[PDB]
Design a protein around this ligand. Structure first.
Ligand SMILES: Nc1ncnc2c1ncn2[C@@H]1O[C@H](COP(=O)(O)OP(=O)(O)O)[C@@H](O)[C@H]1O
Lengths: 596, 687
DNA sequence: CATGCATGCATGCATGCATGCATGCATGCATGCATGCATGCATGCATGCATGCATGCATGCA
DNA sequence: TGCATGCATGCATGCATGCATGCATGCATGCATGCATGCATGCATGCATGCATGCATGCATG
């Protein structure tokens, strides 16, 4: 029987749980969906866990005492509130855990300065996920069959990790020969099991000082929380700092620590991981539906992406289209056909070449800036594991591996050696990377979009000598890149005037609306080619072979594959489902300025 | 582990309301108990008596005038042990302390507590000087002094005691409330569920122990750090403690070495006894049990053995089990703690109040014809024998004494024997006499031997004393004796040793005591085989020598002549007994014994003195007796010899006869009544 | 007098060796704790002594 | 000669006296066990020596 203390934490929180009805409809939708989830699985043929997000908002405006008690000694208020919450689950119609979401300036400190203070409290820690261990299940409930009596039995096992209170440990040996001497034949399947995982978290390098030895702690996960993180991200972790173990006083330092009762939140980096958690309201999409009913919004989106840069109209138009990415149609039992678009630009220095690059990085999603050399692990993983648990070989995902469904920013492309350029033919064309070293030959997938930037060989001689061999690049790399933009050094006065007041007003519709409009178009706007799309480009591509060869070079059928992608990405902008001839009229003009 | 339980019993507002009732009471000049507390502060009284009725009167009072009072009668009634000290620390809040300058001869206890009051304050005056002298409203400045100084506890200097008192049903008759604490309950009715309650039992005080001090707390002188260590013991046994437990002897290399002290310790009066069952509500085939009751403090030396008393108290266990192998694991041995004594048969020589007494005594006095009314009232349930009842009324008086000083006493005791058989129903009166009279033990012939009614030596329990007999018990009282004819011949010798007063000689194996006894003797033997032969003589039909008959001042004979006219009134007498439960009709009202004995006990404090004219009347009247007794000298119907002890009785009798006039008026009619009861007592064998 | 080719030299990185550094297995050595027994203390049962009483015998009386 | 009465004598019912019996308890002795030390083992990690790449030079070219 519980005491008076235990029920009072219940009834006070039950008073709060009756205070706000927003969480009532939450658990209602949990139960109805999982009922309907089992309803469709068991009627025609003849997943979700139990936790609800509670903010750290309302407890301050309800009970400042119950506010305070959690933030110091959480080991008294967490069990009865859950017991009261499992009461609500049983009354309105299994752990039924919680979140404790909420921002607080109390204990959001660095893990670097965490030790020996604020022990047995609840601390919010962020940092780097590294050296993720293996996923193991845990034994809980054993099932045994006795032969002659013909009945089953019952036996449980517990550990100190889950319970959060120091209870008297009672170990029990795994049973054999129980009562009279019948053999306890073991069974499985009905014996229950729950997965288990432990990981280490390094602190933030951007928060770190200049150079010192980093120090870290460990986090053990729970059943529905196993394996949400790959090693190498930025994740906020909210849990309770608990120290277990007999600290060396049995028979030189004990009291090793850990953090349990946890919730895991991956957060966006500058250049790592997902940023697609941005919501869309009905108020949001109604603005998009009001926006997409126009006739000239491609121009407005073109002029939008030069917030501080004069000119370069047709360059910006393609930068919309690469983030559209084209359509992907993998053939039936054949191969995929590549859909993304890769562009290199060239021009004289101090002409907004480096004023373009981070704008491509920050506006887009899942981008990696690759600068200078890319030696030994950018396109590769290098398989260097000396794992102390067992002699084996695993991988550490390189940047080209990591930038899948994304953008790779290549800076100073001409300074790259020929070594990694072998891999670029493999990456840009077959969309796969196969690594075959003596441990394990492998094969993986990476379909990144690529923008690189190279200089001329000597001087600013961009137009003087000849258009051929201003770069002196290998021949297939011409065929790898789709459009090759040449930026001139035109000296004028009217053009200088447009430079003049632009920079002067600089030092004295929007971007966050834009990426909502971008990521919405990915999952519902892919179009399909129509009959009108053939008749123009058949006439047009013959002109591309018959007369462009009298001016420049080369013309491959791979160029016609890009002609499909340009009309494809243009239909994504208008969010049409068919493909119009006007999309080709846009796409035909894009080759003329890029080349002639 | 170790959970908690909430219950509707509070300690907070109960302490608040109990402060108000301790202050605000006016009904029974100013406040009642503060004037009592000022009398406690007058340092002339040691007890504090708390009823339950003024509580219930206050609890009636608050609901009728104000909104709501917390219940406090049934609150105390449940647990009753925490209400001792939680009530008593509220007393020390308010006190008219300096109300009298101390007497030089007041109390050796008083001079010690006056020090510990003063040594507390002088130590308190030191610390408040240092803190204000080292600064960086004064309530916190007061509060710093509170916790930085070791003090004497307020439990250590009390000097008084508090006893509770159960409520009567009388006010509970007006308003029924939790009146469950006051019922005449039995030891058989004590179920083991009444633990901690406040109860009411009754029985017989049996095997009273001796009063010896019980050590409670022990002082310990440091002799190096100069502190005083105090150890409280609530167990049966304990131990002395280590070399020192000071704070200053601590954190230092050389600790002290202590020893206890006697004059600084606190003791307590301790004595216990056992209560036997009342032997009236016992089931039809059972043997009466006993019960242990501890007594502490003021109420000691107030319980004689062999009485009838109402004991009220609270029911607590003691940690004890029986044999080692018979222990089932949690065996609780109980007891009772005494709180209040109310005795049935209120003992004489213990009152001095007269005003409310004479509120009823004067109505007995102004009733008229009182002396004839009295012997009618003692055991009226037989017919006739009014002069026989009249002498027994005078046996109830006794109560005279004289020592010449450096000489001998005279015993003012009456020894009336009864002869006759069998249809007089003498034992109807023999049980009745020792019943009304306080200190009355009913005895038989053979059921006590020559060693039984005298003392004996046995090994003492927890506290080699001389365990006494019935005559040892029934001193300053009347012993009722059946069948003296069938005693032991050695048992006769002790009876002759009582006719000289206070003498019981013992020459046994290790005992040489001559113990004292203020007893009184009533005897009744039966005559010889057959009944009243005039051919048989006096002493012929008597089985005892006349030297024993010489020791008897007054003797009766119980004739039974079947007479025709005497029967019809006696027949109407006995048949009216079963028609009703009361004999007299329209001519007489009986005296209840409780009011009767109070008039007796007040008459016991008179001591009438004779005069000179009554000296002249008795002398020649003794020459009347001396002359005609010594003219027969035969074994005829007249008895042989006339003792001078006959004059010793009849002077003592008319002295005792003067006591029922309550006036010290020894007169001629005082002596005129005395001669009539002599000549009729003897020689009633004429018919 | 102004470029292109063959020739020779300087230098940074891949890795299969030597060596230091974490878990179990084993063995000798010294501290502490449960416990049966020699001892002492408390208690119940049985025999000789004092003796009132029932009984047999000596005695005088009708 | 028969009968009632007083006196001598055995009986077993309570007090001293002797001894056997049962229960509580502090201490000296034996045994399970933690702890220091070094080992065979298993596995991660630094390093130096020679080859392909970059640049200077002599020769040829036009
Ligand atoms: N058309 C333009 N409008 C505004 N600023 C420009 C323009 N062209 C160049 N800039 C300036 O040139 C700088 C960027 O130089 P950039 O050409 O990006 O570097 P690099 O040629 O070395 O890659 C920016 O600070 C920007 O102010």
């Amino acid at each position: 029987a519980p005491d008076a203390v235990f029920g009072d934490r219940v009834r006070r929180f039950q008073e709060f749980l009756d205070t706000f009805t927003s969480y009532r409809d939450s658990v209602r939708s949990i139960q109805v969906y999982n009922s309907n989830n089992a309803a469709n699985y068991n009627d025609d043929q003849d997943i979700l866990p139990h936790r609800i997000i509670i903010s750290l908002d309302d407890l301050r405006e309800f009970d400042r005492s119950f506010w305070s008690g959690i933030l110091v000694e959480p080991a008294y208020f967490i069990p009865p509130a859950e017991k009261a919450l499992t009461d609500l689950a049983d009354s309105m119609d299994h752990p039924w855990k919680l979140s404790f979401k909420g921002s607080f300036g109390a204990h959001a400190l660095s893990p670097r300065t965490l030790t020996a203070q604020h022990l047995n409290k609840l601390v919010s820690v962020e940092g780097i996920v590294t050296k993720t261990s293996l996923v193991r299940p845990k034994l809980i409930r054993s099932v045994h069959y006795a032969a002659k009596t013909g009945r089953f039995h019952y036996r449980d096992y517990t550990d100190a990790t889950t319970t959060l209170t120091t209870r008297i440990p009672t170990p029990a040996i795994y049973p054999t020969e129980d009562t009279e001497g019948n053999k306890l034949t073991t069974e499985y399947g009905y014996s229950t099991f729950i997965d288990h995982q432990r990981i280490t978290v390094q602190e933030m390098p951007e928060m770190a000082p200049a150079g010192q030895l980093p120090r870290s702690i460990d986090v053990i996960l729970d059943d529905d929380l196993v394996d949400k993180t790959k090693p190498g991200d930025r994740v906020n972790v909210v849990g309770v700092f608990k120290s277990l173990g007999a600290g060396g006083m049995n028979q030189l330092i004990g009291f090793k620590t850990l953090i349990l009762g946890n919730t895991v939140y991956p957060l966006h980096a500058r250049s790592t991981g997902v940023a697609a958690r941005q919501m869309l309201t009905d108020f949001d999409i109604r603005n998009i539906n009001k926006l997409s009913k126009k006739k000239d919004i491609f121009d407005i989106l073109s002029q939008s992406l030069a917030p501080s840069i004069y000119g370069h109209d047709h360059i910006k138009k393609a930068i919309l289209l690469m983030l559209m990415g084209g359509v992907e149609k993998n053939l039936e039992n054949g191969s995929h056909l590549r859909g993304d678009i890769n562009i290199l630009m060239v021009g004289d220095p101090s002409t907004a070449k480096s004023q373009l690059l981070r704008f491509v990085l920050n506006t887009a999603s899942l981008a990696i800036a690759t600068t200078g050399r890319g030696s030994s692990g950018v396109g590769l993983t290098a398989a260097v594991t000396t794992d102390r648990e067992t002699g084996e070989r695993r991988l550490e995902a390189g940047a080209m591996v990591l930038a899948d469904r994304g953008v790779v920013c290549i800076d100073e492309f001409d300074k790259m050696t020929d070594v990694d350029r072998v891999a670029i033919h493999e990456v840009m064309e077959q969309q796969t990377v196969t690594i075959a070293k003596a441990g394990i030959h492998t094969t993986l997938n990476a379909r990144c979009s690529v923008i690189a930037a190279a200089n001329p060989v000597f001087g600013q001689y961009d137009v003087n000598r000849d258009p051929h061999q201003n770069i002196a690049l290998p021949d297939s790399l011409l065929s790898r890149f789709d459009l090759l933009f040449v930026v001139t050094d035109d000296i004028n006065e009217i053009r200088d005037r447009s430079i003049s007041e632009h920079v002067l007003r600089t030092h004295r519709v929007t971007i966050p609306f834009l990426r909502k409009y971008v990521q919405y178009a990915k999952e519902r706007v892919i179009p399909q080619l129509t009959q009108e799309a053939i008749n123009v480009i058949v006439k047009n591509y013959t002109d591309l072979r018959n007369d462009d060869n009298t001016k420049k070079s080369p013309i491959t059928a791979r160029t016609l594959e890009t002609l499909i992608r340009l009309a494809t990405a243009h239909a994504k902008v208008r969010l049409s489902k068919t493909v119009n001839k006007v999309d080709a009229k846009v796409a035909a003009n894009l080759l003329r300025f890029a080349l002639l | 582990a170790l959970p908690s339980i909430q219950l509707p019993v509070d300690y907070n507002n109960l302490f608040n309301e109990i402060t108000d009732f301790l202050v605000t009471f006016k009904q029974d000049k100013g406040p009642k108990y503060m004037a009592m507390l000022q009398k406690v502060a007058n340092r002339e009284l040691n007890s504090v008596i708390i009823d339950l009725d003024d509580i219930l009167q206050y609890q009636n009072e608050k609901f009728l005038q104000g909104t709501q009072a917390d219940d406090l009668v049934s609150a105390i009634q449940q647990n009753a042990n925490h209400f001792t000290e939680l009530f008593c620390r509220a007393i020390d809040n308010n006190m008219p302390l300096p109300t009298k300058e101390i007497d030089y001869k007041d109390d050796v206890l008083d001079v010690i507590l006056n020090q510990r009051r003063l040594r507390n304050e002088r130590m308190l005056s030191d610390r408040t000087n240092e803190i204000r002298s080292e600064n960086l409203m004064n309530d916190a400045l007061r509060e710093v002094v509170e916790d930085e100084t070791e003090l004497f506890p307020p439990n250590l200097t009390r000097r008084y005691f508090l006893y509770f008192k159960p409520l009567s049903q009388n006010c509970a008759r007006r308003y029924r409330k939790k009146a469950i604490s006051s019922k005449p309950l039995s030891v058989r009715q004590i179920k083991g569920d009444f633990l901690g309650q406040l109860i009411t039992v009754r029985g017989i005080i049996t095997r009273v122990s001796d009063v010896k001090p019980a050590v409670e707390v022990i002082a310990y002188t440091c002799d190096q750090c100069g502190y005083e260590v105090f150890q409280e013991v609530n167990s049966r046994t304990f131990t002395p403690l280590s070399e020192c437990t000071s704070e200053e002897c601590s954190q230092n290399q050389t600790k002290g070495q202590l020893f206890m002290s006697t004059r600084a310790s606190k003791f307590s009066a301790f004595q216990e006894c056992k209560i036997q069952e009342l032997s009236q509500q016992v089931p039809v085939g059972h043997i009466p049990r006993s019960l242990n009751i501890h007594v502490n403090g003021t109420l000691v030396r107030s319980l004689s053995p062999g009485d009838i008393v109402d004991v009220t108290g609270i029911f607590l266990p003691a940690p004890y089990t029986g044999f080692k192998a018979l222990k089932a694991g949690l065996l609780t041995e109980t007891y009772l703690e005494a709180q209040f004594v109310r005795q049935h048969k209120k003992k004489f020589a213990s009152f001095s109040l007269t005003s409310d007494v004479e509120e009823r005594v004067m109505e007995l006095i102004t009733s008229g014809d009182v002396y004839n009314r009295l012997a009618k009232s003692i055991a009226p349930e037989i017919y006739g024998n009014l002069d026989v009842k009249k002498a027994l009324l005078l046996l109830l008086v006794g109560g005279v004494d004289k020592r010449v000083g450096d000489g001998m006493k005279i015993r003012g005791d009456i020894n009336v024997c009864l002869m006759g058989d069998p249809g007089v129903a003498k034992s109807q009166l023999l049980k009745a006499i020792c019943k009304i009279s306080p200190r009355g033990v009913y005895t038989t012939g053979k059921g006590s031997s020559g060693v039984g009614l005298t003392a004996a030596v046995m090994k003492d329990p927890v506290t080699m004393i001389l365990e006494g007999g019935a005559l040892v018990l029934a001193d300053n009282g009347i012993c009722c004796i059946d069948e003296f004819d069938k005693m032991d011949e050695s048992d006769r010798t002790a009876i002759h040793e009582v006719m000289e007063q206070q003498t019981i000689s013992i020459s046994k194996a290790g005992i040489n005591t001559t113990l004292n006894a203020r007893t009184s003797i009533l005897a009744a033997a039966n005559p010889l085989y057959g009944r009243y032969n005039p051919r048989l003589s006096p002493l012929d039909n008597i089985n005892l020598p006349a030297a024993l008959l010489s020791r008897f001042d007054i003797l009766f004979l119980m004739l039974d002549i079947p007479s025709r006219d005497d029967d019809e009134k006696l027949a109407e007498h006995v048949t009216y007994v079963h028609m009703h439960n009361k004999q007299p009709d329209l001519d007489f009202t009986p005296v209840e014994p409780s009011k009767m004995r109070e008039y007796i006990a007040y008459a016991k404090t008179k001591r009438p003195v004779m005069s000179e004219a009554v000296n002249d009347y008795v002398v020649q009247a003794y020459i009347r007796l001396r002359q005609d007794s010594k003219r027969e000298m035969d074994s005829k119907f007249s008895f042989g010899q006339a003792t001078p002890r006959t004059l010793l009785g009849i002077i003592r009798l008319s002295q005792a006869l003067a006591k029922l006039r309550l006036a010290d008026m020894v007169d001629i009619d005082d002596v005129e009544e005395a001669l009539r009861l002599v000549r009729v007592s003897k020689e009633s064998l004429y018919q």
